[PDB]
Structures are given as structure tokens and as C-alpha cells.
Amino acid sequence: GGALFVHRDTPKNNPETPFDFTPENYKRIEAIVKNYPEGHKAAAVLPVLDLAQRQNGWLPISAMNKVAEILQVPPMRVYEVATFYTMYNRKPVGKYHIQVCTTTPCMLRNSDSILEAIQKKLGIKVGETTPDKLFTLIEVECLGACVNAPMVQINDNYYEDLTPKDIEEIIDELKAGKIPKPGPRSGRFSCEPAGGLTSLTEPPKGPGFGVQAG
Amino acid sequence: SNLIEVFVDGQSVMVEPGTTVLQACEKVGMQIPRFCYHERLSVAGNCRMCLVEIEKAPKVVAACAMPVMKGWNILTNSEKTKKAREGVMEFLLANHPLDCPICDQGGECDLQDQSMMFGSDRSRFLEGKRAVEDKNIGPLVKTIMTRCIQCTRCIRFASEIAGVDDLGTTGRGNDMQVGTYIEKMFMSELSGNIIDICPVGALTSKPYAFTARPWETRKTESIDVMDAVG
Amino acid sequence: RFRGEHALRRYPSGEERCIACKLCEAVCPAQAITIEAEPRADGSRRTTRYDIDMTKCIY
Amino acid sequence: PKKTSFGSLKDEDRIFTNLYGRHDWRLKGAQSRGDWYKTKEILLKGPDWILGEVKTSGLRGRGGAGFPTGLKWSFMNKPSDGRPKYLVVNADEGEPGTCKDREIIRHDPHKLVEGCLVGGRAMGARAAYIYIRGEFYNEASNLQVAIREAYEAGLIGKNACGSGYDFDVFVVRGAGAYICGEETALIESIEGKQGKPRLKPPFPADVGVFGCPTTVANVETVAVSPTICRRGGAWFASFGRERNSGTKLFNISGHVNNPCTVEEEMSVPLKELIEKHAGGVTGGWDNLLAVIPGGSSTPLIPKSVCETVLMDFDALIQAQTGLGTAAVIVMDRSTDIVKAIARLIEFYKHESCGQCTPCREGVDWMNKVMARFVRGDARPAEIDSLWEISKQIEGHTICALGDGAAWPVQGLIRHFRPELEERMQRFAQQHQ
Amino acid sequence: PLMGWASTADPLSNLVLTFSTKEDAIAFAEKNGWSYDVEERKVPKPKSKSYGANFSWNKRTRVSTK
Amino acid sequence: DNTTYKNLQHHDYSTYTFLDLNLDLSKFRMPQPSSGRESPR
Numbered sequence A: 001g002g003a004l005f006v007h008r009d010t011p012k013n014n015p016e017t018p019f020d021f022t023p024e025n026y027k028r029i030e031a032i033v034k035n036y037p038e039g040h041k042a043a044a045v046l047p048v049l050d051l052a053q054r055q056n057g058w059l060p061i062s063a064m065n066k067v068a069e070i071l072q073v074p075p076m077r078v079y080e081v082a083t084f085y086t087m088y089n090r091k092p093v094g095k096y097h098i099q100v101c102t103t104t105p106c107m108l109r110n111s112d113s114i115l116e117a118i119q120k121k122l123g124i125k126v127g128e129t130t131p132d133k134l135f136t137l138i139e140v141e142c143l144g145a146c147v148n149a150p151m152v153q154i155n156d157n158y159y160e161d162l163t164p165k166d167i168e169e170i171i172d173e174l175k176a177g178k179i180p181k182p183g184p185r186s187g188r189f190s191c192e193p194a195g196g197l198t199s200l201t202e203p204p205k206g207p208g209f210g211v212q213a214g
Numbered sequence B: 001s002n003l004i005e006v007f008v009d010g011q012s013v014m015v016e017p018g019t020t021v022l023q024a025c026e027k028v029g030m031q032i033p034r035f036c037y038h039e040r041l042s043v044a045g046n047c048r049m050c051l052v053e054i055e056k057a058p059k060v061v062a063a064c065a066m067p068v069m070k071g072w073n074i075l076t077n078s079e080k081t082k083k084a085r086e087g088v089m090e091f092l093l094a095n096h097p098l099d100c101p102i103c104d105q106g107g108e109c110d111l112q113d114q115s116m117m118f119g120s121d122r123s124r125f126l127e128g129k130r131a132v133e134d135k136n137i138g139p140l141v142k143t144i145m146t147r148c149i150q151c152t153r154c155i156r157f158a159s160e161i162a163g164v165d166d167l168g169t170t171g172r173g174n175d176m177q178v179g180t181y182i183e184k185m186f187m188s189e190l191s192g193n194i195i196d197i198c199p200v201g202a203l204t205s206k207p208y209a210f211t212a213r214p215w216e217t218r219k220t221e222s223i224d225v226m227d228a229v230g
Numbered sequence C: 001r002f003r004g005e006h007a008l009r010r011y012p013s014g015e016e017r018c019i020a021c022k023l024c025e026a027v028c029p030a031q032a033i034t035i036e037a038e039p040r041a042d043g044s045r046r047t048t049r050y051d052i053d054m055t056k057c058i059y
Numbered sequence D: 001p002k003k004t005s006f007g008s009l010k011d012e013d014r015i016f017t018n019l020y021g022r023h024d025w026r027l028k029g030a031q032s033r034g035d036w037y038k039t040k041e042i043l044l045k046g047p048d049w050i051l052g053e054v055k056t057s058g059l060r061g062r063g064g065a066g067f068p069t070g071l072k073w074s075f076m077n078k079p080s081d082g083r084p085k086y087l088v089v090n091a092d093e094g095e096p097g098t099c100k101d102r103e104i105i106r107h108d109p110h111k112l113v114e115g116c117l118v119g120g121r122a123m124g125a126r127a128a129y130i131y132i133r134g135e136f137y138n139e140a141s142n143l144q145v146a147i148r149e150a151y152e153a154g155l156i157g158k159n160a161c162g163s164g165y166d167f168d169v170f171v172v173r174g175a176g177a178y179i180c181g182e183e184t185a186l187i188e189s190i191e192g193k194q195g196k197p198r199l200k201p202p203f204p205a206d207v208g209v210f211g212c213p214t215t216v217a218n219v220e221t222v223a224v225s226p227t228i229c230r231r232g233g234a235w236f237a238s239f240g241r242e243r244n245s246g247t248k249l250f251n252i253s254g255h256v257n258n259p260c261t262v263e264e265e266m267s268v269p270l271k272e273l274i275e276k277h278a279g280g281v282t283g284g285w286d287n288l289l290a291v292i293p294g295g296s297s298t299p300l301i302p303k304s305v306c307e308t309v310l311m312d313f314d315a316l317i318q319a320q321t322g323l324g325t326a327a328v329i330v331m332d333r334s335t336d337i338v339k340a341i342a343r344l345i346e347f348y349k350h351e352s353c354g355q356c357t358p359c360r361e362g363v364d365w366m367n368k369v370m371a372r373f374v375r376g377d378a379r380p381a382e383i384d385s386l387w388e389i390s391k392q393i394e395g396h397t398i399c400a401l402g403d404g405a406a407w408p409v410q411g412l413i414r415h416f417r418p419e420l421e422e423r424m425q426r427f428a429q430q431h432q
Numbered sequence E: 001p002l003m004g005w006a007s008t009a010d011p012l013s014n015l016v017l018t019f020s021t022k023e024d025a026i027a028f029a030e031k032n033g034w035s036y037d038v039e040e041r042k043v044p045k046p047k048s049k050s051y052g053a054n055f056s057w058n059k060r061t062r063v064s065t066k
Numbered sequence F: 001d002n003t004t005y006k007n008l009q010h011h012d013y014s015t016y017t018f019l020d021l022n023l024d025l026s027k028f029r030m031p032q033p034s035s036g037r038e039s040p041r
């Protein structure tokens, strides 16, 4: 299309670029493949390729061909799966991959202020990996954590109910390397009403009430 | 006995239990306009031009893959259908280049035929018109992918019949490119035939190139040599 | 709007504005035109032989 | 029975304890909280009693589908075949302003798993997949821990709960796409092929995951179902109007003080849903502009309507906007709603697949047109063009997303049209 | 040699005559006096396409990429 | 009825533990069917 962040092709530079799984990781992949009925075994392409991106921060095309080899599937399905889904990044990123929900009530919640504050505090524009390494900034659509005030994502974590000052706090904590507590902050610990802790306040019922007359 | 009465415009016809809708309309002479469906290729819901209304039924059903229970009455010219066809044709013509002068299939391409004989007469939607990076493939197949309607024919053929399995789609929304992701040459026996299956001018014959034009040429029956299959 | 003789035109920085698309030949009510188009060096398409019979031509 | 009064809630009769992340999260905590109690007697009591139990409850599905569960799960009662059966629990939560599945699967895993087992034995499924949004790594990991607890306890697996039946469960993370949450394309995302939805004439029931009969059901349905079997049928049917009965989560977002998550009676006045549970509308009840009921796919509700309209599938259909996932968002008057809904359209454009031409083209249109409305450089006649675009898209495509992308615009057009042409006109003036 | 348009003495080259049924072809050929040769009509062979057969369990047919 | 958030243990996950727990879930489960073939090809 005309409006795109990055196109999807392999032009050059990684035909043979080395990628190898770790033996323990072969054990892991075997464990994964054991979860599907035989005669298919192609269902594991997506989880195994996930794993590839997991141990190697970004997958080169040699990783795609390699997974296709491990599962003995035509590689074009591997490339296809790699492009069609958002998780997989086919281009290298930094150690920390920053993701913000700009769409809807996060958007209604001032999250744009969060984005701008990030761009200034880090000092770079959107979509560009920072000079040196380890910080990348892209906005993603709804991540599902919503009632908690506008959320930002770092690798496998949810920072919820985020004000710009605390954004700066987190970012500098990552500059030092100490990863802050994942859970949402400024009260609201684990998705609650801030004021009342309303609805159920009572001790939960035991294994009763189930009489059923049977 | 393993036959089913199903009306077409009130005209009954006896068909087999599990023949498609499009076939059932073929039997009485209706040819429902279509793209991605092809006689030799497995069914897909991509083109959406096959839509047809069945009375008493609120939604329009796709005639390609819909099996025919007993007693369906298939109204081809019902207003809802024609509106559906005009719609689908419009959305297809939304993003398409104007290549008909340069394009090789100008005397043939089914977008022009079905465009006149079905779709609406005037377009809309000014700001728009995405473009696609073209991809060289073989010496045989000249490739301009901007004209691609993304109808999945070439894929299904290469997979099932050709057996190479090297063609696919990568993308979402507006942006889906149909072809090799790694820019590999695709060449095989039977590969050239793909230029007949591409319904639009996306794929065409490289050596035949620009030389000719369909209406000007005189077709002549013949046989083949160089292969004992006759 | 007067109709004289059949000049071909080209773009500024002349490209041979003719694309070879065959239409002018296709609608010719006297059939008198000829177009044969071989893709040239640049890969763009122009006409090899583009002919008219002003005899046959009804203007 | 329960008369027109609804929205009054009774604690200790609720379904989900711990939803706020309290007390003890384990098989031991959930054990003492009532999960997995007598459940062997359910499974040995037979499938038909479970099915008839759900139908007696008359509960309705989730995810905005609104279909009755007893039928969907009743399809699988077909005499068995040489091919296995599965239970696919949908853990994906798409659309904005929701949080629906996340909080449940985090704070009460064993209820979800127990639901999976009860449904599996009910329809005869061999195993239960759970496909979760890949964003949820930590969450689904907690799910892994709880499932491991279930196997170590011998609670599921071979001879689950010591019963005469064995039911395994598997869990698969997602690849991070919205349409993976759709009933059908989910199947093939499990199959490893890029997720795109199948045509409906083959049903998921008839030909499912790996081509074998299976069903798809949301975390709410599956998770609540075993306790539905343990509450006695009509008990659950006590709440809500007899058309749509029982309880459901309502996750309030948008602009209100204390946006949060609660569980309520099915039928509730939206006004009460705001007042007596989550804070209040910022700036007062009169400061609201419009409210989006349920999922983002649902059309707008104007003030004078949402004031009087309760929360019900059928009642909201009377409001012309079908109910979504029940997580509602509200909008300040100060905000520009055209920008909000336009951005929502951008969400739909970025999440969709390229099979049906009508979404992959039309939704492009509505993106660019809605952006033009944001800048207001269009002309007044064009809004109706946008309408007929939405109509010609709706109903012509495979999945509901295409339909789901048509409704919001239509909503914005119906009530708020006169708000457009003043922005149209002030662009005419300001620009010329 | 002046231009190179194709040329012939073949006054009958460009004729074509549309007939409804073959009996009318042989009829007009017989009657009109010049010898003829008939080719037999061919049609598409009736097929069974079941969309579900794309996804089937043990059957070799399965659609990759769909 | 002490009020404290008790899932704090989930903050302790590096990015392996999901799949590693899948490894720890090895066996414990019925062998799944073979269909008719090794691969659909």
C-alpha cells in the first residue's frame, strides 16, 4: 500500500546468515511438537518460529528456512506466517521494544501525551531505533488492557495507568537496567476501582451452596 | 434417487446432492460472474463476485462454495444481487491502475468484460489508489503486480497442480503482495500456463510481450508436436 | 475542431506519445491503419510500423 | 419473578471471586473458594444432563455473538466417528476498551480449566485448546502453572478427578493478530497456516481443528459453565429478562473517574452501571457525549437514548446497537468523536485479512474518507456516499469484522450527522 | 513490396457462418455444394467440488495457504 | 480477608518459563492420534 511502516521482502544481506537453535531448545521444540496430532506437525510452525524470535531477538530469513527444515514444510508457508502476524519482527530491534496503544480509550485517556513524552525523553522520532541500541518505539493497536489507564508495553510486560512522569521514571530505570515492577501503579493494583474497591468486598464462599439436590 | 429438485427463477432442475450453486446455475444456462473460482482449482471465497440472492434468505450467499440443499430458489437478477455485484465490482476497481492501453490483456481481461456487463458505470473515491512493487520472476512470465486483484488463483494452481508450492501472500489489508517473498526465480514445466489463469493483466507472457492484441488475431485449431501426448 | 492530416504528437521531451495500444486502428471505420509494436530497448512499448492510407481514410 | 427492577446486585451470589486479584491463587485457594467441588459427580452424571442443564439456564454466548449455547454445544452430540473431537476455548480478547478475558484468566484459572473439562465431557471432546493473545505471555504462563497444578494433582489428564474419563488440555499462544480471535480463522491459526477465516457452509462443528469436529467458545462461557451446572439451572436464569438471563462482566472505560471492572446482572440501566459501580462520568451526567455499548464494533448511543436504555442484547437491539462484549466506554463532550471513531476505523484497517475484497478495499475507503472528515476537507454530499459504502460492505463478507467495520460509521452517521456539516462548513470558511 | 500488408486471392477467407445445430451445418454444406469436414462438440466434464474437502483429516487433499 | 495482591509471583517470569513449563508438562497426557498419514504433503 501507499501508507506503510516497512515493506515486506528479503532484498539482501542474510542468505546464509547463521542461525542455530540451542540443544536444550531442541528439547523444548520437541516438547511443543508433541502437543499436536500426528500427520500434521505443521501446526508447530507458528510456536516454533515464536521460539526462534525468543532466543534470537529477531529472526533472519535463515531462521525461517531453518524452521521450515525442522518441520519439513514448504518454506513459503513459513515466510507467509512470518509476515501475516504482528509479533514477528523480520528486522532487528533493540533489547527493549516499546509499544503503546494509541487507538481508543487509551487514546481517550491522553496517551498521546505519553507518546510525545517518550519521544522527547528518549530524544528520537517514532519507528526509529535509538542511537546506540536497546530502545525502539512503535505504537501498536489494542493490547486488551483497557480500564487501566493508558498502557505501555516492554518485552513481555504490562505497565498500566501510566502518567508521563512515571514514564520517564521507567525509561531511566531501564537505562540503569533495573526493570521496574510490572503491575499497574498509582493505586489500582491489579485492575480495581480506585475509590471504593466496590462490588464484592465479602469473604468468598467456601465449597458450599452447590446442593443441587443431587 | 440421489437427485434434488431446486428451482432457478422458478424453473426446476434436477441436480446431484452436493453440486455447488454455481454449477446448478450452469446447468440451465446461467453463468454467474466470477473470478477466483476455476474448473480445475479448489474453491475459495476470495473474489466475492459470485454472490447471488436466494429468496426467503436475508443474507446473500456466495455461489462458489455454497452447497445446495433441497428447495433453494436461486434468484439471479433479484435487485439485491445486482446491487451486490455492483458493489463488489466497485471495491475491486477501487485500487487498480489504468493500464488498459499498455496492459497486454486489454482485449480479454475479465475485469473489462464483467465490468461492463455487470458493474456500475461510474466510479467514485478520489484520494486513494495504492501501488505495489513489481517483482521479476521468470524469463517467461512478465510481471506487473499493481494490476493484481489478489484472487488467489495463481497460488492454488502452483500449489495443487504445478506442485511447486513457492507462491503465496504476505500482508494484510490494502497491502498484500502475491508472489515469492525471497525474489526467487519460479520456473517449472507447466509454469507458463499460469499466464492464462491470471484473470487480469498482472501476469502476462514475456516473449509474446506487446506484439499483438486479442481482437486482431485469427484463432486456428491445431495439434501439438514435441510431446507424444498429442 | 477542423480535421486536417493526421499528425502524431509527443510529450514535452518527446516520448512518441503513442503507446501502441491499437485503439485508433481498432475503431477505424475504413480499417485503414496498421500497428505492429515491439518493445524497444528501454522496455517501454512503441510502434514499429504505424501506417495510414490517406486514400482509404474518410477523415 | 424479577420485575422491571434490575441493576441491583447481590454479592456472595456472584460468579467470579478474586477478579480483583485477592486472596489465594492456587488449586488450594480456588479449592477452598469452591472451584472443583463435587465436579466428578457432574462428569459421571452424563453429558445429556449437562447439556439440558445449560439449556435450562438458557444462557447466551459471549463475544457479541449472542447465540444460545445449548444448541452450539448440542451439535457435537452426533454419534462418534473415527475422528477425534476437541474443545477450542477462545482466550483472545480483541477490540479496544475490553479487558474481558485477561482479568479472568489471570486471577481464576482453575475455573476456566474446570469449565473446559465439563464442556469436553459434555460434548465428548478429547482435549481442549486455549488460544490466547500472544501479548499475554505472563498471563498464559500463569495459566500454564495452574494447569500443571491440575496434572500434578491428578485433577485432569488420565481419569480426570479419578473419574472414568480422560481429558487432556493444551495451550497455544497467539501470534498477535486481532482476527485470530474470530471463531473460524482461529481454527487455521491453530493449524499453523496464516489465520484467515473459512467460508461458513462447512461449520466449525462439522469440520473443525485439523478437520475434526470441534467447537469454539469464549473464556466467559466455558469458565462460567461448570458453576452453571452447579447453581441448579433456573437459578442463573433468575437474573435478567427471560430472553437473555444471568450475569456478565461489564468493563467500564472511556472518561469516568475510576474506570474499572465489575460483574452485574444482565439487565442493568446504563446510568446505574456508571453511577453505582465505576465512579461517575467526569464532569457530571450531563457532560457525556455518547456511549459505545459493549465492544468497539457496536454503533454509538446518543445521550437521550443511553439515559433510558438498559443493558440487554434484545433491548440494545431496540437501541439499534447490538451488544458487544459488554465492556462499555463513554465519551466526554469536549472530545471530537469524529476523530475517535475515525481512529477506530484505522484499527479495523490495520487488523483484517485480504480474502474478501470488500473489507480490504472498502475499509481502506472508510479510513481515508474518515481521515478527510477529521480534517473536514470533503464535501457535504459525500457523507451519504460513505453510508452506501458501509451498506455495500455489510453482509457481503466472510467474517463479522467486515460487518463489524461497517456499523460504527453508520452509528456516527445516524445520530451525529448535523455535527459534521458545521466542521465541513468551518473548513470551507477557514480554508476559503 | 510497397508496404507489407498481408494479401491474397482468397475471397472466401474471411467468411464465418453461425449455425444453431450441426444438422444445419451439414445441410448447408451439402446444399451449397462444396465438401466439408466436421469436428465434434466438446463440453466441460461435470465435476464435484466440496469446499470442505480442502480441510479434510486423513485425505491427501489439503490446501496450503488456502 | 486481608487485602493484598497475591499474584505478585508472576513478576518473576523471564521469557522462557512458558515453554519450559510446557516441557515440564511432558507426558502426563494421552498420546494423540496418528491420522492416516505422516504428513499431508
Ligand SMILES: Cc1cc2nc3c(=O)[nH]c(=O)nc-3n(C[C@H](O)[C@H](O)[C@H](O)COP(=O)(O)O)c2cc1C
Pocket (backbone or CB within 6 Å): D060, D061, D062, D063, D064, D065, D066, D067, D069, D072, D090, D091, D092, D093, D094, D095, D179, D181, D182, D183, D216, D217, D218, D219, D221, D399, D400, D401, D404
Ligand atoms: C471480528 C471478531 C472478533 C472476535 N473477537 C473475539 C474476542 O476478542 N474474544 C473471543 O473470545 N472471541 C472473539 N470472537 C469469536 C466469538 O467469541 C465467537 O463468535 C463466539 O462468541 C464463540 O462462542 P461463545 O459465545 O459460546 O463463546 C470474535 C469473532 C469475530 C468475528
Ligand code: SF4
Pocket (backbone or CB within 6 Å): B096, B097, B098, B099, B100, B101, B103, B104, B105, B106, B107, B109, B110, B111, B112, B147, B200, B201, B202
Ligand atoms: S488488468 Fe484488466 S482492467 Fe486492469 S489495466 Fe489490464 S485490461 Fe485493464
Ligand code: SF4
Pocket (backbone or CB within 6 Å): B147, B148, B149, B150, B151, B152, B153, B154, B155, B178, B197, B198, B199, B200, B202, B203
Ligand atoms: S497475480 Fe493474478 S492470479 Fe494471482 S492473485 Fe493476483 S490477479 Fe489473481
Ligand code: SF4
Pocket (backbone or CB within 6 Å): B101, C017, C018, C019, C020, C021, C022, C023, C024, C025, C035
Ligand atoms: S495505438 Fe493509437 S490510440 Fe493507442 S496511443 Fe497509439 S495513436 Fe493513440
Ligand code: SF4
Pocket (backbone or CB within 6 Å): D179, D196, D197, D351, D352, D353, D354, D355, D356, D357, D359, D360, D397, D398, D399, D400, D401, D402, D403
Ligand atoms: S471480511 Fe476481510 S478480514 Fe474478514 S474474512 Fe473477509 S477478507 Fe478476512
Ligand code: FES
Pocket (backbone or CB within 6 Å): B034, B035, B036, B037, B044, B045, B046, B047, B048, B049, B050, B051, B062, B063, B064, B065
Ligand atoms: S467464486 Fe465464490 S468467492 Fe470467488
Ligand code: FES
Pocket (backbone or CB within 6 Å): A101, A102, A103, A104, A105, A106, A107, A141, A142, A143, A144, A145, A146, A151, D095, D096, D097, D098
Ligand atoms: S484500548 Fe488501549 S489497550 Fe485496549
